UniProtKB/Swiss-Prot annotation, chains A, B:
This is ORM1-like protein 3. It is linked to Asthma: The most common chronic disease affecting children and young adults. It is a complex genetic disorder with a heterogeneous phenotype, largely attributed to the interactions among many genes and between these genes and the environment. It is characterized by recurrent attacks of paroxysmal dyspnea, with wheezing due to spasmodic contraction of the bronchi. The lineage of its organism: Eukaryota, Metazoa, Chordata, Craniata, Vertebrata. The gene is ORMDL3. Changing I11R: Impaired negative regulation of SPT complex activity in the presence of ceramides. GO terms for biological process: ceramide metabolic process; intracellular sphingolipid homeostasis; motor behavior; myelination; negative regulation of B cell apoptotic process; negative regulation of ceramide biosynthetic process; positive regulation of autophagy; positive regulation of protein localization to nucleus. GO terms for cellular component: endoplasmic reticulum; endoplasmic reticulum membrane; plasma membrane; secretory granule membrane; serine palmitoyltransferase complex; specific granule membrane. Ceramides bind to ORMDL3 N-terminus and stabilize it in a conformation that physically restricts the accessibility of the substrates to their binding sites in the serine palmitoyltransferase (SPT) complex, hence inhibiting SPT catalytic activity. In the absence of ceramides, the N-terminus is flexible and permits substrate binding, thus liberating SPT from inhibition. Changing F52P: Impaired negative regulation of SPT complex activity in the presence of ceramides. Keywords: Asthma, Endoplasmic reticulum, Hydroxylation, Membrane, Transmembrane, Transmembrane helix, Ubl conjugation. InterPro entries: ORMDL.
Swiss-Prot record, chains C, D:
Changing V312M: In HSAN1C; partial loss of normal activity as measured by reduced formation of sphinganine; affects enzymatic affinity resulting in the accumulation of the alternative metabolite 1-deoxy-sphinganine. Its cofactor is pyridoxal 5'-phosphate. It is linked to Neuropathy, hereditary sensory and autonomic, 1C: A form of hereditary sensory and autonomic neuropathy, a genetically and clinically heterogeneous group of disorders characterized by degeneration of dorsal root and autonomic ganglion cells, and by prominent sensory abnormalities with a variable degree of motor and autonomic dysfunction. The neurological phenotype is often complicated by severe infections, osteomyelitis, and amputations. Induction: Expression at protein level is highly increased in brains of patients with Alzheimer disease. No changes are observed at mRNA level. The chain crosses the membrane at residues 23-43. It is found in: Endoplasmic reticulum membrane. Pathway: Lipid metabolism; sphingolipid metabolism. Changing S211R: Loss of catalytic activity with L-serine and palmitoyl-CoA as substrates. This is Serine palmitoyltransferase 2. Changing Y75A: Decreased catalytic activity with L-serine and palmitoyl-CoA as substrates. Does not affect the negative regulation by OMRDL3 and ceramides.
Amino acid sequence: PNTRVMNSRGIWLSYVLAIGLLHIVLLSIPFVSVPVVWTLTNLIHNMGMYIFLHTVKGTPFETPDQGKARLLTHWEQMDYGVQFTASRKFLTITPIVLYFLTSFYTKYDQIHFVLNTVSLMSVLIPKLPQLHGVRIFGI
Amino acid sequence: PNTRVMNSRGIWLSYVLAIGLLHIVLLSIPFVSVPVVWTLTNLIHNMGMYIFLHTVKGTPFETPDQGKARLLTHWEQMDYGVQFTASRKFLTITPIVLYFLTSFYTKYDQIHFVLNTVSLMSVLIPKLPQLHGVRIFGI
Amino acid sequence: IHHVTQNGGLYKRPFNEAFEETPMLVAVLTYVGYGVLTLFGYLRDFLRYWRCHHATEREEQKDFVSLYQDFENFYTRNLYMRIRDNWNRPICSVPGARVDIMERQSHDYNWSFKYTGNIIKGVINMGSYNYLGFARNTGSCQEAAAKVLEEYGAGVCSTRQEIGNLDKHEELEELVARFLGVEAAMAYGMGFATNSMNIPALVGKGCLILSDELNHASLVLGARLSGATIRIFKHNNMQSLEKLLKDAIVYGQPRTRRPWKKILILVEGIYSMEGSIVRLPEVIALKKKYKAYLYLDEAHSIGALGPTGRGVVEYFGLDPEDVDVMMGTFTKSFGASGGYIGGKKELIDYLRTHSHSAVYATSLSPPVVEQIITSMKCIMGSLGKECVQQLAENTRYFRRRLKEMGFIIYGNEDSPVVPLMLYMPAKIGAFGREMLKRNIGVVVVGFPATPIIESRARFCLSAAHTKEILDTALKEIDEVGDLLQLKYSRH
Amino acid sequence: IHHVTQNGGLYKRPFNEAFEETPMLVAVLTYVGYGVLTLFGYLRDFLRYWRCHHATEREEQKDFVSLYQDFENFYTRNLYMRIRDNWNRPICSVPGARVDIMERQSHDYNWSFKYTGNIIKGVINMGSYNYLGFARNTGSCQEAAAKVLEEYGAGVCSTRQEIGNLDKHEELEELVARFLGVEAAMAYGMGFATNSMNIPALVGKGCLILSDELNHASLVLGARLSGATIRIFKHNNMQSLEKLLKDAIVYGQPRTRRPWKKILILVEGIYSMEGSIVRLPEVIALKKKYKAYLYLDEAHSIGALGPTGRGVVEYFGLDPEDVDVMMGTFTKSFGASGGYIGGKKELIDYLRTHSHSAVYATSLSPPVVEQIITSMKCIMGSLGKECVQQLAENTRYFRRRLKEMGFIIYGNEDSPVVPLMLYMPAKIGAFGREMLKRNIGVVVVGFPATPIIESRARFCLSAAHTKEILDTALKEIDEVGDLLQLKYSRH
């Protein structure tokens, strides 16, 4: 019920292969280059992990806690709020690995530095534990 | 009794003027140059603040606590051990100001960087609060 | 004596429960099945920005702040609404062994249904709480209530501490106390209403409640209504139980560090989903070690465990005088409606005064009291106490039978509830239709009432099921588990 | 009624104490005075790596692990040993108003002394605890003990719960109880030995002690011997008192959070250094607000405060029945030796059983009991109760007199102890020699028994001091405070 959804079995293994499918899909595109494949897949991943963690709030089902986490997005409500858990740290290490392979590919270019950093920036900034409930002028 | 000795009145004001005397003494030396005056006075200060805080342990008098702080140097025993106090932070800010004026003088040289950093290094390293009681292979 | 392992939990018999961990390859495919399904939901609700027809909030003089969250209704219309043909089917007969089912269908893709005329007859059911087989309109057991019905009527128009208090009510409250072997007993209107109206009359503001992970919607709700701190321990984990139980005493409240006022434990006998029995003597041994109390819930357990089945206490052979308060129902072995509370006479009298339900709610209907009485008479001694030996034979036969057929089964082996594991959400939606083609109606358990990788189906065994009724069902399952490849187990 | 300010502390009179903060320019020069002195100590001890002559640990068959820390003896040989000529001078007369002092000197720079032959006579002292002037070998007051001395002897060879228990002991223990106005009283051998042997017989393991910053070496030591948590509050800071007192109840121990067993407070009437009186009604009002107890110490206060001086309770006019236990001595107003404990009869009887000193230590000498009795008789009614009106006149005259002379004085104005502020460590070493040249012997208080920038000198006023004795001393001070520029005050 969205508090044990990443604390389940093999969700970590399935989270990789979704990205691994998404790359091999993006690898087989005709009018594309092998640097900007990695540039694309680090942008889309960090787009998903913002929209599916830090934007949508509540549950797709109905919570019998009378909607306590109605005002809380999905990152904030994992494991009933205790931050330094076994599964939040897995969700923070993984975009960094997706930052370093996209650092390895594109050969350390300047525009591939700029575009692939602010995606990795804007995903870890809400994952600061002292940024638990503060929402910037909206949502 | 060495726990209220820096928590006294005007000890901060008198700590400055000892250094201020020590510079004007070192300023009036014939065969010396105005860079290495500042190089000398940042070395001697950070030598004193190691030997008078982190080396000598106990009290010059006799403690009626049956020698509880006999194994404790003077930094460790300030204010009965509570670290983030009003006077320890004054003792950490002051060598940094003595680092920046000796950064300003000598005109940012390389040997004046090397010699004036490791004095400022070896004085703040024991002032890490998580380095409370650990002593490197001796003392 | 079997096990006295570490906590002093003295066991007589072998325990033998089985929680087989789900396979790696099976689990990954589930999230893909939900992942494609959560994908089209955003697609479908995006298509609804212009106008399967909806309930259509009144425009006439309304359009205030909107009533529902659109997003909280996501799973009910994109995973539930697709396959909601099952677990809702109207039946039109006595829910015994063979059940006449009215047939319905939807050409609007389950958005609006329609009875044709059809009555699909002789359908073996395995999804009704009919353990001891008292759902019949025949025999002298139900006939006694007909004399009661023509005499009394069908319900008091009053309250227990008010006018409405019949001699039958006073008779039945005695009768259960001898059945349970406790001092006094008191019946209530429905089994849900018991826990939601009496648990708040026990614990107060400074109390602490140690409930299981998966109790019921009853036991959580009573714990919400009494303002009291609620703490969850892992399912049948005495080590995790004692760890909370240790820290509950050596600390107090979170804000103040005062001692707790009193603490107690909410556990059930037979958990309905993943049909398993609580490690009860390790609980009795532990509550005496820490001076806690104990609320027990024999909703499923009574009439199903112990010889001449009297709940889990006789099944462990223990005494009723160490359980501080016993609760069970009459809907789930007796074919009746309502529930009781058994306990000490001091406790019952306090709850005959502070009840929320004897003082506000109306009491039982008179003829269903008689259906409880005559059923307990056939147990206490006429389709009587031989059927519990039949059901335990039916339990133990059916439990080894699907395990050797390559299926995966949870829970204790002696538990009559048979949790059968699906994993894929499409395998939920096919299986209820598939068995219904093979003349059998079962109960499948969806996603949010489970975890993600549980999504199981469930079988209720019965003493009314004979061998030929049971083996015919075994034949039908053998095809379907082949047809859907749901042979997940290694053994 | 004067002040009822915030805590309910009801005041009758104006309070009027004065803690003038030390000047900025004065304080900086002190650290230079120590800074040059701590510099030569490392110089001097470096010179002692070859061989003012030392005590010389035996070489003969020794040289184990060495006995003392060299560094813990730093201040005693480099700041003390330089100027230790004063506060150690032998006197050879009755310590009344004029005191014959044997003269000594050292050519070895205070490392070894030598009496010449000289008896410096008629020296006005202001450093003896002779408030009510009972140090005389004349008059009928001391004459009564001579009858007691020739009769009894000079000391029991026994213990109170053992054989040694004279009628005088039973008489005196009555006599103080009427003097204090409490139920029962009990005398002890010396005033130091009282607190170090009875406070551990009261509080136990789970207790909490709230003592002042500067009590004595007595009251700390008794708090060390009873294993009990000790917490220090600021001097005469009821706000800092209540802040600890608040958190002492709303928390418990640090490890467990159990409640405390009992708590109490150690305060003194007149603090010897910085002679000041405790804000007592704000303490009585606060201990009733938090159910704490109270240990009070009238070592200096009795015979010095209140009319016909009976400690600080009559000086605040309050009742003796709210102080849970009263302690004072007989050395510091009566010219005797020993101390008492006053309290309730239930308390005294528990301490007549659990005493550490009535059961082990020998009791008082018989003739000094008589010197206590006849002194209290002259107070209770012959140099009697007129001298306390004389001393308070002498206090109030002398206290305004040095304040208007540009000196700086601490403490309450009505306090007979006169703390006179030095600051420089050389001004310690000159001032004791300087006044001794001007025929007056005083007491200077060194560094470690003070803070760093206190280093004061101290005057004990006396009722035996007349006006001409007092004004002659005022003349001598006027030169010296000019000579050393110790006119620190602005007013």
